[PDB]
Ligand binder design. Structure first.
Ligand code: NI
Ligand code: NI
Length: 309
């Protein structure tokens, strides 16, 4: 039945550079109501909404999320659900957790206690995702310890809602094997795919050091074969552990030449489809965007590379 839920993720897109910034709009995107209609009409099944809850909580236990922030996330979720999209909400960019997980693990626990309580009565097509891209000091070991704790508390108020568990090491495809799965029939494991990194993140200012621009991805056979090896590796593991897979982010930065981006994106997307993985493109309208807010239209053929059909 987890597999049937994964199928309602289907074809997805992240709304990035929005609520996972230190505040909404700081990174260039404010989520407009009309985007959900636009995304649904284009052919997507789902949206994934990164959210930096840790920027809108009290310092003192039990770390109350600010009420106006919760109402803003409720509005966004509501608009997406009213467009009959599956919705995934996460916690994202919890900077202290990356550095000091032992110290901040219980804050993540309490954030999730509140969100889970707030959304408990929501329809089944709202999924929760405990944390985006565990990495740094939140090691595979420490993540295997923390995530079941958060899940326990989500389950107290939401006994059956799908919960997405990311692989550690920035949700690298390889990191799937280092995940210790709990016995829960309502989880989906997620990886993010940006290989080759030198191509998808060429010119990216936020990476140190910035890989140089001008890197090509040609869609040759050995290149395609590379994607298949990575995805077969995840599939093999997922089949053995009886767990659905969500490719929760993939995309190539717009400093890459468009032709390469199109071929890479189409290839990655077709590979996720080949192995039965749901997916969410990174991302809707910012630096990796498939939608142009100024021209008010999809960027083609990259959008088609994502959506297919
Ligand atoms: Ni705030
Ligand atoms: Ni509203």
């Amino acid at each position: 039945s987890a597999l049937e839920y994964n199928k309602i993720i289907g074809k997805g897109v992240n709304i990035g550079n929005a609520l996972e910034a230190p505040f909404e709009g700081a990174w260039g995107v404010r989520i407009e109501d009309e985007y959900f209609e636009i995304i649904k009409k284009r052919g997507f099944d789902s949206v994934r909404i990164p959210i930096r809850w840790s920027a809108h909580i009290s310092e003192k236990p039990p770390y109350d999320i600010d009420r106006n922030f919760l109402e803003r996330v409720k509005h966004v979720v509501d608009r997406a659900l009213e467009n009959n999209l599956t919705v995934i909400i996460n916690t994202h960019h919890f900077e202290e957790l990356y550095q000091e997980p032992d110290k901040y693990g219980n804050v993540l626990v309490e954030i999730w206690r509140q969100i889970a309580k707030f959304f408990k009565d929501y329809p089944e097509n709202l999924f929760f995702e405990i944390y985006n891209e565990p990495a740094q000091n939140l090691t595979a070991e420490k993540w295997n310890e923390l995530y079941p704790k958060v899940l326990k508390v989500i389950r107290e108020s939401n006994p059956t809602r799908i919960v997405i568990i990311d692989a550690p090491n920035w949700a690298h495809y390889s990191a799937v094997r280092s995940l210790k799965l709990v016995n829960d029939k309502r989880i989906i494991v997620s990886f993010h795919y940006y290989e080759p990194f030198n191509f998808t993140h060429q010119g990216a200012e936020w990476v140190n050091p910035t890989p140089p621009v001008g890197v090509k991805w040609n869609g040759e056979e050995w290149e395609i074969n590379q994607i298949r090896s990575h995805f077969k590796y995840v599939s093999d593991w997922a089949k053995q552990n009886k767990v659905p897979i969500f490719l929760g982010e993939f995309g190539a930065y717009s400093k890459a030449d468009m032709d390469s981006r199109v071929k890479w994106t189409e290839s990655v997307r077709k590979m996720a489809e080949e192995f039965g993985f749901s997916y969410a493109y990174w991302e809707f309208c910012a630096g990796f965007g498939i939608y142009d807010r100024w021209s008010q239209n999809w960027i083609e053929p990259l959008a088609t590379a994502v959506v297919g059909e």
